[PDB]
Amino acid sequence: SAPVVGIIMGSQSDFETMRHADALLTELEIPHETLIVSAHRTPDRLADYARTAAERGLNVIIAGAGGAAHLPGMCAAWTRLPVLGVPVESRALKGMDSLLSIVQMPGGVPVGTLAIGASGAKNAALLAASILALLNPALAARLETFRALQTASVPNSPIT
Amino acid sequence: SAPVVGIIMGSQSDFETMRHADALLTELEIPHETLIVSAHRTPDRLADYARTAAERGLNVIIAGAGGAAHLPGMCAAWTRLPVLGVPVESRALKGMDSLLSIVQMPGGVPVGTLAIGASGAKNAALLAASILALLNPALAARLETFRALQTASVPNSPIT
Amino acid sequence: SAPVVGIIMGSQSDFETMRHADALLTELEIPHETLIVSAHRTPDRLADYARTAAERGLNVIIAGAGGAAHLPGMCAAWTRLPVLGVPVESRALKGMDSLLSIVQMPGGVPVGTLAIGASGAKNAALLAASILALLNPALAARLETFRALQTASVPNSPIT
Amino acid sequence: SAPVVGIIMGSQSDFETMRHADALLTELEIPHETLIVSAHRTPDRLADYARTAAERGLNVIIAGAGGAAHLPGMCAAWTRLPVLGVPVESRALKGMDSLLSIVQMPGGVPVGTLAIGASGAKNAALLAASILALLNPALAARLETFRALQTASVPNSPIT
Amino acid sequence: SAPVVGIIMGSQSDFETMRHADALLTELEIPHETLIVSAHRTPDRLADYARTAAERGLNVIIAGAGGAAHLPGMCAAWTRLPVLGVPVESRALKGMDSLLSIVQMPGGVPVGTLAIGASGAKNAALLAASILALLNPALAARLETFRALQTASVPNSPIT
Amino acid sequence: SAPVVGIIMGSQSDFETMRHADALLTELEIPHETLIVSAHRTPDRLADYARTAAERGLNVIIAGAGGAAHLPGMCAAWTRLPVLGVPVESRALKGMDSLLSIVQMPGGVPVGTLAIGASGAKNAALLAASILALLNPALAARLETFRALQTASVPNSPIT
Amino acid sequence: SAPVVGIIMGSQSDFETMRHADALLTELEIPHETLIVSAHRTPDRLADYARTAAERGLNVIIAGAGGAAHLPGMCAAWTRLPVLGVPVESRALKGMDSLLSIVQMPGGVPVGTLAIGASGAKNAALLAASILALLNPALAARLETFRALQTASVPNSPIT
Amino acid sequence: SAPVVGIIMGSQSDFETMRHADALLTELEIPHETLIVSAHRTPDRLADYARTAAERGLNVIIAGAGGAAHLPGMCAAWTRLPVLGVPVESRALKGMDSLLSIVQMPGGVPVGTLAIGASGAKNAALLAASILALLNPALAARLETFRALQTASVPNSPIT
Predict the structure, then answer these.
(1) Do F57 and F30 touch, CB atoms closer than 8 A?
(2) Neighbouring chains of A at 3+ CB pairs within 8 Å?
(3) Residue D69 DSSP symbol
(4) Is G82 near chain F, with CB under 8 Å?
(5) Pick from H43, H97, H78: nearest CA to B150
(6) Is G38 in contact with E119 (Cβ distance < 8 A)?
(7) How many domains does chain C have?
(8) Could you give the 3-state DSSP secondary structure of residue F127?
(9) C91–E contact, CB cutoff 8 A
């Protein structure tokens, strides 16, 4: 019942995107916490969060941010846990700024980066699930059921 | 002694980049295999590789490709294992095509994407290690030692 | 009456774009099938589809996808038939990701790529028609009639 | 012995790229002609070339150009034959201008566009072959042999 | 009363942009014609138009197009008159494709390129006016009056 | 013998590009001056140059600049003469910054923009010539001869 | 009560963006003037404004512009005061043109550039405040209060 | 004699760029310190550096970083001092990732961003000087002398 994934984001408006990650973890019954942590406005909150993540029992952190998106990278700077990054779509540059500022981490501190926007949020949750499935065979079966339903549910022909 | 990470790439020329992942896993004492699998020229080889990866005891797959880089995404389509993608730098577009064709996966099938080029290959090995560290406390200690040494090795002032 | 062109797409929402290809083939009376095949969610459906395409009497495949758009390329990996690719406009990056992930095929496995969006869908159908016109003189005459009407119908002066 | 494919390019400097298409057609025993036609410096030469191509027995045209690359699109404006476009890599913008000015044809006049540079030239010859293979079962067998050999030649592991 | 500027565009929908050029020439009392000429759908109409432009008394041609925008360049290929190009904003790529396919003319055949969209249309008309002002002192005075009013009319402080 | 075109550039390093415009005007026997004027380091020099250009008998100004390239736009702000802009290729962004900062003038003050680099410089001289040819039938004949020779010099086939 | 910051912009429509700078300075009780100055339409107004800025007691200039955005750079060309630049979002290219034409100043004349759009306007005001805080300890305390409230006000968890 | 500007960078390889800022501050007789601080490998070093900067008597911070360049933004998160950011040119993306990850700060925490590469480093030192000149009339006189000499040194015509 204690969280094994932390979903964090810089602001309330990021939640429109990150709620898709939150929903997916819930559907797969992965205990998690969903929090606002701003790299730029609450840097000490972030330092404390990432530094204590492991010892609190978190296994994976999903971090979402837009623009000059620094939250995932700085989070990875302070934890050895895998950090997954979701570029939030920005108004002017449509998440191209978010994408580059998250994915282009220099060697030594990784961030596993997902697609811009809602698809990325969903896939960060699914990637976290595939990571946790390595430790948890019940979850591994639920994830397989999910992928099997995803595959079987694709229609054969489009509708008008 | 059996591999727990698979490093795959479309061609020999990709190895100039992916060798950095290979070396880093060796440095961390993570048993792995390093193979050529082409999404476009050996699509059946890829299907079999990805499909059987879990049952062969693989935990993580690192896939590198450039240009219309489809190896990581298609690998993830056939395995429930976590798949990490390395955009290989391309001649004309300098890995921007590689990057977008790997990271922009629609929701449902993730690829955790790292930086373009050698940095990404290195960080894919480290992200893979941080995943395996959740299962293996000895590796977790090696990774923490790696990170601590990285931090301690940064000098305080530049040389002129 | 048996299909000689297959139009395939990853999802129902791609059909808003790909229906323009479907309409054009119908207007030119080119027998075709219009299907959903997802590279990422139904990779085995795709392998079977492309592998058997030729022997089923298909002559050309038109494949549409968005984002990390892998459907056309993987389809070309499994058939010697000409494969035409339509980049579907994506939400954030407006099909620039779709375009690069389709057009930048390395040498050995081609995809003939058309414009992003509806114009590309229409032109993939027209390109398939110009290919089939090489085998079928009645179609060749209908295609010439189409191009002649297209040319003659352009007005000389704009309206307010 | 008469050409069934025309390879055209705006300048001698384009041949460094387009020679790969020329060589591949020769490898597949496809009779072809290889010519310079400049959209901007010889627009009447282009009009006559494209307009008479079909009646001269050409089945496919491969056109390469760079920068504001107009040769393929204008060629397609005057022939009902399938026109394949190769973006030639440009100095400053590295073929991104070439690519967009070829692929983004509005609906009504297609150009099947290949990758920037040598890969695209090679794949234009292969796409042209896959088109002609629909008319010519001997060529179809050569193409299938080409593809089979390509697949078989991929090694299983990289060299260090 | 005979036209000294020709404004041409590929389609009716370009007129939403090019009408700003038409309006400006009218405001400055520059006799002009405003026409639809499609590079891709009416290439012979274009050849005839550009070839005869000079002898018909045209002094400047303003050409607008979007996407793979070939109209200005091909027009310049057939006339020694100055050709001004207006990139029309395209749906997906917002005129970035239009811009590159117009401005990146290789040396030998120029197109003087203006901004994407309505601003470019207005400025193509103003640039044509500054060209014609070199021959016509009454126009030169009207153009100076225009620039003087433009300058004097800028407010000093913004409004809420 | 007095100059009718002014070629201006921000620095000596720009001349590697702008010399092509200078040489072409000389080839066409167009009297001109070639000067350094920096928008950023000599803004008063620019104001005086542009402001007095018309009264000194200049008909056209060719301005080259790179990076945040402001010389052409600011020159046009102070003269009613036609101003042609040459984006000089920049180190990091390869003239894309130069290009956008010159071509994207808001409506009211035009700059006729040419290709990035040497091609643009050459085409600015040719566009300037085509403008002056409207005033000068001898130059018009030289330009027509230039264009005819260009067309005749294109070979029919490439060399291997 | 005399202004110590000047906020300038090229047009009324820029005010939708620049009003955020105006509001922030007011909130921090920084005396300022908010003005329209167009680089392209009122270049002499700009020369006079920047040249006299220092002697009028201005300490910082915040300049906003879109498209080929020349206002900040030219302003910096005529004053030794720090000039902060706000790229205004443009219709087609979404401020990517504004950004490059402001930030890529060559060495010798700086512009401190902020984010595209409203965020940039707000931050230009905050950056001006942090500059003025070096001279004014009461302001420095108000700025600290602002940053402290900004930090403390970030919620811990998102809302549905 | 105590430093009033801090120049910080993530690595030795950044100094090739940041040395230009260091040299320029020395040329203007501005006491400063030049240090390595890595946002990703020494995040606690960064927190302490930025947090204590003001109390140590620093007035301005110049921070350089490349790729996912987080050093300037995170530095600004912990200090109320003005922070100036220099995008260091990256291998693949040529500083476009560096640029966007520095300049696109959301509202609330500014970074005054300079040009990619050496020009930006030089202009960060000059912008820092123009800030300190507000506090120090002797420096203000040196800066005005620097600017006057820059202006006077521009030659009137290029060398061939």
Answers:
(1) no
(2) B, C, G, H
(3) -
(4) no
(5) H43
(6) no
(7) 1
(8) helix
(9) no
